């Protein structure tokens, strides 16, 4: 099926019982382990923790079922255009295809994708192929807050740094956004449980 069984054949190992699953997570990022009944983020294998049983050490839902992602999950990255996906690869001289080296993917009845291929998405639907980049952009470690805005380095320091930053008196933006994104690039490493394939 060409990419569509490039995402099938790398899928989804469970963290907690390591069963593999041969599995697209397309943009649907809650997995639930049939075998162990453990529930984990597709992208980057964090847990979903139940009420009052989170251990990140400043969470702020924690009675609540929710997970943590790292801001390279496809949780995230997602929700990217594939555009700005496609420039982070390019940035790095990291091929990508856009062209086929409805959508063949299969999915569970264990029946096909079968959703709209536009060009350029490589014989691939939207969000399928946005899996495709995201895993170019994860297995080559690339990190994505080198395209972010300021107000998504605003936003990213709250969540990974849990301080509301502020520009300082006379600092023109991109000083600003510089000092954001050192900070957090120095501060805050990438998925560390994100599942890598090979570059
Ligand atoms: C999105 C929706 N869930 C699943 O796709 C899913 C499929 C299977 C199982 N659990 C799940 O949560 C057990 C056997 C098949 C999550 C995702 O990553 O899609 C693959
Ligand atoms: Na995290
Ligand atoms: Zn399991
Ligand atoms: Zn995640
Ligand atoms: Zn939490
Ligand atoms: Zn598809």
Same mark, same amino acid.
């Given at each position: 099926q060409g990419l569509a069984?490039?995402?099938?054949?790398? *899928?989804?190992?469970?963290?907690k019982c390591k069963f593999s699953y041969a599995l697209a997570r397309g943009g649907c990022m809650h997995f639930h382990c049939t075998q162990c009944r453990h529930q984990?983020?597709? *992208?980057? /294998?964090? &847990?979903? /923790?139940a009420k009052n049983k989170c251990p990140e050490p400043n969470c702020r839902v924690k009675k609540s079922l929710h997970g943590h992602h790292p801001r390279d999950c496809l949780f995230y990255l997602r929700?990217?255009?594939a555009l700005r996906l496609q $420039?982070?690869?390019q940035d790095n001289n990291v091929m990508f295809?856009?062209? %086929? %080296? *409805?959508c063949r993917v299969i999915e569970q009845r264990d029946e096909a994708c079968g959703k709209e291929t536009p060009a350029g998405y490589? *014989?691939?639907?939207?969000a399928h192929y946005k899996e /495709?980049?995201?895993s170019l952009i994860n297995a080559h470690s690339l990190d994505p807050a080198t395209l972010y805005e300021v107000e998504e380095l605003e936003t990213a320091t709250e969540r990974y740094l849990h301080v509301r930053p #502020? %520009?300082? &008196?006379?600092?023109?933006? %991109?000083? /600003? #956004? &510089?000092? =954001?994104?050192? $900070? =957090?690039t120095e501060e805050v490493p990438l998925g560390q449980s994100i599942p890598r394939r090979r570059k």
């Open positions: 069984m490039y995402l099938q054949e790398n *899928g989804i190992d469970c963290p984990f983020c597709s *992208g980057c /294998y964090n &847990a979903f /923790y929700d990217w255009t $420039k982070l690869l295809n856009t062209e %086929p %080296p *409805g490589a *014989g691939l639907c939207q /495709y980049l995201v #502020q %520009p300082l &008196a006379g600092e023109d933006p %991109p000083a /600003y #956004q &510089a000092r =954001l994104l050192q $900070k =957090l």
